[PDB]
């Protein structure tokens, strides 16, 4: 009964710091706050989303945090929890995500804190100590999740070992004011400069006028891009590195010479990445002086021959392939979209299409860049999206989210597709699987032959609806009505990609 | 070119050391001892088992280590690839299986050691002492996998950061004979005894006599067996308990019971479990006194009475239930059999049956009792034990691999039946799924509520032979011949089970 | 001679850092960047600090830390070494203190991060890249230890497995400017506030007006003191706490009342501390309004109400306590000092005596209140405010540093004194023992009893100058010349404690 | 006051398992179960022991085990304790201690378990099952750290998170009876071997016969002595390695040659150590053939000759050194005492100078070797060994137990001097201080110069009895009566050393 009144104190206080997901799966013992949890969800206040693979369900919570940005609960139950959620845990961790995760009684340096309650003891001597003492504890995993004082989002591990009320107007017991984190650098950007937007990357006005070369995650400061094709055809004296970029082949040769300084703005405290030649790390930039025309004529005129180059090769092949299919989906997309990106080949694909991303919420697990969990992910992104959508009162149908992933990741994380009639289901959410049986040592053999699954059989065992679709069909499928959720498979070629990666270098 | 010469060596001091089977995924970086290892599967020292899902990998690995009792490795590339393992290294580790873990530069207290070679240096000076210090270090991870030396066998970490000859004959490089762990306990069997043999239970043959509740996987050392369902209507005065037994709640109240002396005896050094009242533990019974015919013919008497009980109210009952499926698969069996359970239903319902497993090898992770990978699991003990068979050189079709998993545990686990053709695939390998769109707090919403998956439909997917066969034609089928792998799917009522129950509680 | 090439490479990307001392253990084992450092001990770019006792060493370095302000390395070599450290890494972790730990072969949470160098490989080939992957990592542990980009200083580890050029003019490989971390907080300076600042308390320009309880190590904002003791006798309506208090029964008291609200000002940004009724957290504060007179006057009041009972008590008892020796060495004090407090007496004493800190520099292991090491702090952080001075290029004698220890202190520290003819030794350190033979449940019952240690004998055995002294000389001596490092011991009363406090008690 | 009936229940179990001596230090928190411990005390069941220092009472507590083989508990009580207690838990795991740490809420894989206790909950309906969950936790905790069914005894953390009758007539809750470790080996003695008896060596009868080079420390299973200095000079065509040996330069050069199988035969399960040509392992050999005579004539001639060389440049030396002390020691122990040997230059010293160890108990802290706590290593070690010898009833004054230390040693664990008048005190223990000024990479500075500590006046400093002695008088006064703890210092010169050991090698 007292861990009734200390269960009810954390919900109510998680829900007062901006929790509206909750995951939960079925368990061994008696999940932490679990009647708490239910009884907050039977009166609206958060949603229970319940799944049985507990990897399955850390998955849909990094989805859910990333869609609208605010922090996601899951409730562990079992033996097996530790260690099912581990996969989610290191990507929260590397892609800064507000994820905390709930036990009641071994996740080491890959959380921002591993905070434990103390045991409910009964004494109504100390009621109002108590509970004090609870929700400070929970605005301080709150805290440590969401970055609020570090900067820093992640994932956080509460233990409470297993109504009095909080702060009046449903405030939180501890607030925190937004943190302004402040490092200012020099840059002259008289010489010749090039900027690398990478994962995480922040929004810089005095920027927006230099070549950038954005990785499709990454916000766009201004309209001057780069292609990545394009960088290796230039010789900049001076990057600016935004986020952590770590696509592309040609940014990791330029980033890696010693010849060019690298300045390096990031949006928290952690050290910059992939660089060893970072002159100096900062926040933002205090510029001087302004690009050369001509640096800018030759940076733009060589995005142009890159994007025409490879425009024309993917328009001359006769074989639809995966970046065909990238291809189609980012001239589908249309502002207010949500694009969730598997983290091989579609988001690579996609930034060598040229996507332009503004006015996109563009959304890939690049933390550590798994493909475990890509379809829960996507289903949780489109859940939290809708959910902001609905809370904005608009009568609109709700946005589309539209998920880019391949066959391999589609079929190994196809269980996200298993979704009790009782918990929640998007609105509109479609997956567009590129399905061409492979990949991008001995382990590469599967990848020389085909898995050969069915994969409309595989979604007609989920109840999904799926359809076989045409490239040149998919923009306007993508417009027409259909379930929640549904699968757009679209068959691709293989064999011919030494073919048509040849003919985009004979091309440039 | 050094860390090749390390590979070589480290993988040949491993099939010395009794590996047959290494797992391995594609991963981001080259993997460890890659090139060694499938040198060594080309010229047939070992064979290779490729999979795309880090989980399943480690399901798989381990029941390539429980279908025939050898160590086992699996090797790691990618940066999810140690959170990935973690849930097979748990049950590894609580069901002390030879599970060897190989990395190329976090496991915790779950491994029996974790220890990392020197890197490889340029140094033809000390061939002799690079080449003893490796294949010593080999011999000491496969020592403490095996529990050669602590007869407390359990997984490994092994770190390779990324030919000088073995000894003569084949030979390990430092042998370890069988170790002998003797802890004798005085037992005075005039007084009524009871055993109850759990998983890991040891044979004693100055037991056999007494009456015994056996879990599945309790090697049985007689024949005078006792139903779980008969324990509550007895009054033991006495306990010896072998191995870990976690299934019955008969057993767990007993256990607990003050009043009742328990005397734990285990085949290894770890500490008596489940029960407070351990008055002393052992290895082995130094027996006086024998049981009263009393006391026997009581306890025979209440099994044949429990016994009797099931298989009437099952005879009687209507509808096809999970538990008529297990006593189907039951029947079928025969010695030579090996039998995969599910760690949730399948493993207490072949238990209620009543199955005799004399003759039979019975496999379960009973470590952690998940239901992942128990797919993977079944496949990896049929391609074991099978391999085992044509090492005999018997000119017979290889035994039956038969296993017994809940449609939950199917679906959840279905992506372990992707296996690419240039990957081994069991010859004889049933999987009985037991379907009632259900398991056995709000957690437990979904069971309410039919999951509905079509399981033909995702046997289709992954182009695995499925059939869906009523109960009385499963022993037929099971002898029926198909494919390599199979799927017999039974239906089964969920909702008639309470009344099962009842008529058998109403009939004891 | 690879792994020479690196150490240089690290040792001096170190001293760029700002690292000035670094301390040394002898060893089993060779130490990590031992040739690279003594060459830069030769050079006088560093000097070397060995001492025999590992723990020794750890608090020696945390003394050079505090002294001045700069990251401090030790370097360990031994199988002892990393365990012996363990104490002082707790205190540099809870006291924020740039401590840099060097291995070459544990730490866990303690801190800020643990990064292991790549192995000095023979490549000319790549000689760049080399030398700015170990500057950047060396930046990346230097950054880490001082918070240049987290302000949360702490200690780091940093392995080193077992000349290239830096920046020009001596720069730092990877520059971090100052960090400014913001988080503004409205406060309504109308409503009855008191201040409390404890350890790690920053500077308030807008709050220095306010009643303010300061912990000698807090650094004043003003001049509106309000005693401890008067406290109790207060009703203050809101609090602002800074930093992170400690010391004082009434704080405690005030911060746990849940009728008061507290605003959390931190420097950094660890979470509020020992309130649970922290109604908000942030950097600074943005008032409205005022402090009333009334409240004013009565804070000033009771806080010289509060002096003249304290007093008035000491001048009048007949026999010299402990409160009456840290009264004395309080009032020695002057602007320049630096005042060392042992974290468990002295460090009390000196506040109920009412110490006036401005122009004070006053350490005290505040993180974990250990009576370990205090020696070899009060040591190093003379050491390093000497050095200091000396680097000003002031003609003048070196400042004085006043250390204020227990006997109790002195004698489980006494081998800190055992300093090598070959070592640097401070040349104006004067340590003031309080020998009462006592300290401030069982194990208490070593207090009722004297150790009876002949303190003058232990500083003889270690030929440091020692002096009995009679409080009333305190002052003088403290003024007079004597070696560079100097013990004053006075003798004091532990038996009339109960009678002094209770006359403080009837007097207020 | 149920955490009250908690503790009792653990120390009375405590007590049943052999625990005698418990170790405790003045905290900020109450110790775990400190009222249930000097109640145990006042009743004469445990003795406390009562230091100030955390680091000091590890050592004290490991001399209480190795004393007289059993269990001893420390009990932690600061935010200091965990890490004032690393050095002493590391050297508890590598040397087999059972060590058991109490907490009442971080070491890691050094422990041999880590348990917490349930928190104490009032409900007297289940006061039963609570009595046997607590004492079979204590019986878990035992096992583990006396290694009663591993083996292998270590150090084991205990948490009580912070009466009911145990068995009949004293017996603990959970019996284990002594288990017995086999694992025979093949060996084959008509083959030249030499057997390596090293720290931790079992006792083997059919052994005795072979040259064997004994560690002082190790137990002689014959009377076939080999010294260390003529084992270069033989060349055995195979090695017995008993334990773990580490002390001698020849015999690591000897393990480590390829050419010459190594056996390891060990008392625990513990993987053979400093071997890479380790060709097996085992517990014992079964023997067949018998050592060549003319193998056996060379041995013992080299013996012979080898122990001549040392005694008799020591006897022509003009100056005593430390191994002129070494050798008076050695010569006036005789059946009975209890030798206690630093673990730098004392144990290395007493094996050159040829210690006939028959009838000896040698302790030195082998397990990491370090200087730390060897002085309380050998006041606890004087203290449990005392108490066994009264225990036993024996009219006679206690055995003696004599310590040889190096100066800096004896400087650096000064403060396990200062022991209480509330505390036990050893009655027959002296320290014998071997007083050079030295030890035995810019670290060894110090070395060359002179500390310079008076000894006589540290001494003094603890009113410890302390006698300046010329070697020659060294064996008298061993014998003559003083105070229950005194320090016997010997001036020696390490000036002549290199002359010394040059004139042993001249001499061989």
Redesign the interface.
Known sequence: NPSTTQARVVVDELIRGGVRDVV?????R??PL??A??DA?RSGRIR?H?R??E?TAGYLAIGLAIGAGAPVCVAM????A???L??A??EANYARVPLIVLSAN?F??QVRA?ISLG?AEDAPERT??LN??WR?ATC?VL??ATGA??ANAGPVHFDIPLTPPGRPAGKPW????????????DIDLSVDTVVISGHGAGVHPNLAALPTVAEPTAPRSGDNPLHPLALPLLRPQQVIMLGRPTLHRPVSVLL?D?EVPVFALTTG????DV????????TRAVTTGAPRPAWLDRCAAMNRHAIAAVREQLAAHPLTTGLHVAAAVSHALRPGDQLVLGASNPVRDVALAGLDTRGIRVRSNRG???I?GTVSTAIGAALAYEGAHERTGSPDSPPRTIALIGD?TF??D??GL?I????PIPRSLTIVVSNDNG?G?????????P?????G??C????VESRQIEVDELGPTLDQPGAGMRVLEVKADRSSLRQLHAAIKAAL
């Open positions: 939960l799966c079925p368990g061994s008696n999940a679990a009647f949890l239910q969800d229970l319940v049985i693979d990897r139950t079992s033996g097996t530790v260690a099912n581990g996969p845990v290191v071994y080491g340096t591993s045991l109002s100590a004090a003492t400070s301080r805290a440590a004082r570090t501890t607030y925190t004011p937004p943190v302004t984190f402040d490092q200012p650098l890696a010693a405290p952690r050290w910059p660089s060893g030649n970072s002159q100096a790390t900062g550590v860049a798994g475990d391999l079929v190994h196809s269980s298993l009790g009639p009782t918990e990949g040592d001995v382990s590469s053999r599967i990848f020389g032959t898995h050969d699954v069915d994969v059989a595989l007609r065992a989920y109840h």
